[PDB]
Ligand binder design. Structure first.
Ligand SMILES: [Zn+2]
Lengths: 138, 98, 59, 49
């Protein structure tokens, strides 16, 4: 037996009564509508791996500041909110709330897990650290 | 409270009482109409074979129901399954026919 | 008419289909994940994995 | 041939499930072979009056 992987890996007696096919009863809330509504809630949410390292060593993601990332992150989620229940402007907004939330932070590739900045990736920093100290033949 | 356990290896399939008793598909039973309505399809395939040839009898408590009539000739043979099974099929969780 | 299986009251068609169905209950005759069948309407609902390329009446 | 590995062949008084697992790994053990079944989720759903 073989089962495929989803991800990419490392390498004439009787004829009884009772049965019928008439289908008199119809679904009162509607089975197809409840199917289509249950589909969207069935989905697990996405992750973010922002600030987390890859295999090579650097933190993946953008270069934008953390709070600016949180603000336009909420604005992009408001723009996504506007597309469902199609309107010009969204009604249930995430940005432009009446509350001052200015000390909020979300993850981005500006930082590493050490604490320092990430204008230069960790792979090139390690490469220059080990290449500052070499010596050749006579 | 009613559940239906299947019969295995020749045993008769049983159904549960309000007193918590398992009885075979035989005898004198009393149903409310709403029970048969809410399970009108699963009970047909389990019960209709035992009403036609077997010895099972059901009193369905309804109260009020509209009726129809069909006359037959007492010199000729007459059977009522083609009307009775049509009614027992067309019972629906929303509606019943006459 | 199509003939049924007495355990779950499902409208089976073929003897091979019945002998494939009864193994879900556990008897041995002579694939998908969930099998829910109702009691007041003729509409069984089954679930299948998300990568399989067909979904002909399949969740 | 390493006699310290093939224990239950060479030891005349050894129980068949004795493993010397912290000290030496050994081949020729006694494995339990299974054949299970994984049935699908099933439920007959019936309404209450
Ligand atoms: Zn079955």
């Amino acid at each position: 037996k073989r089962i495929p992987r989803k991800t990419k890996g490392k390498s004439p007696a009787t004829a009884e009564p009772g049965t019928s096919n008439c289908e008199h009863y119809k679904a009162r809330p509607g089975i197809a509508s409840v199917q289509k509504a249950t589909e969207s809630a069935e989905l697990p949410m996405k992750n973010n791996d922002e600030g987390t390292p890859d295999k090579r060593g650097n933190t993946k993601g953008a270069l934008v500041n953390e709070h600016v990332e949180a603000r336009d992150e909420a604005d992009d989620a408001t723009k996504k909110q506007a597309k469902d229940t199609e309107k010009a402007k969204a009604q249930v907004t995430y940005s432009d709330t009446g509350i001052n939330n200015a000390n909020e932070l979300s993850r981005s590739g500006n930082v590493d897990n050490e604490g320092g900045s990430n204008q230069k990736p960790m792979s090139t920093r390690i490469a220059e650290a080990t290449s500052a100290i070499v010596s050749k033949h006579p | 409270d009613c559940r239906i356990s299947f019969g295995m290896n020749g045993a008769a399939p049983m159904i549960r009482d309000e007193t918590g008793m398992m009885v075979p598909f035989e005898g004198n039973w009393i149903f409310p109409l709403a029970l048969w309505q809410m399970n009108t399809r699963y009970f047909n395939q389990q019960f209709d074979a035992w009403i036609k040839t077997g010895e099972l009898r059901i009193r369905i408590e309804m109260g009020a129901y509209p009726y129809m009539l069909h006359y037959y000739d007492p010199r000729q043979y007459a059977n009522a399954w083609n009307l009775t099974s049509a009614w027992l099929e067309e019972i629906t969780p929303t509606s019943i026919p006459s | 008419h199509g003939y049924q299986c007495h355990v779950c009251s499902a409208v089976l068609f073929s003897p091979l289909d019945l002998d494939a169905h009864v193994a879900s209950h556990g008897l041995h005759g002579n694939r998908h994940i969930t099998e829910f069948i109702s009691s007041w309407q003729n509409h069984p609902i089954v679930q299948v994995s998300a990568d399989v390329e067909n979904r002909k009446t399949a969740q | 041939i390493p006699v310290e590995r093939y224990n239950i062949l060479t030891n005349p008084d050894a129980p068949p499930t004795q493993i010397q697992l912290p000290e030496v790994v050994d081949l020729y053990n006694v494995v339990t072979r299974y054949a299970y079944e994984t049935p699908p989720i099933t439920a007959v759903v019936m309404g209450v009056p």
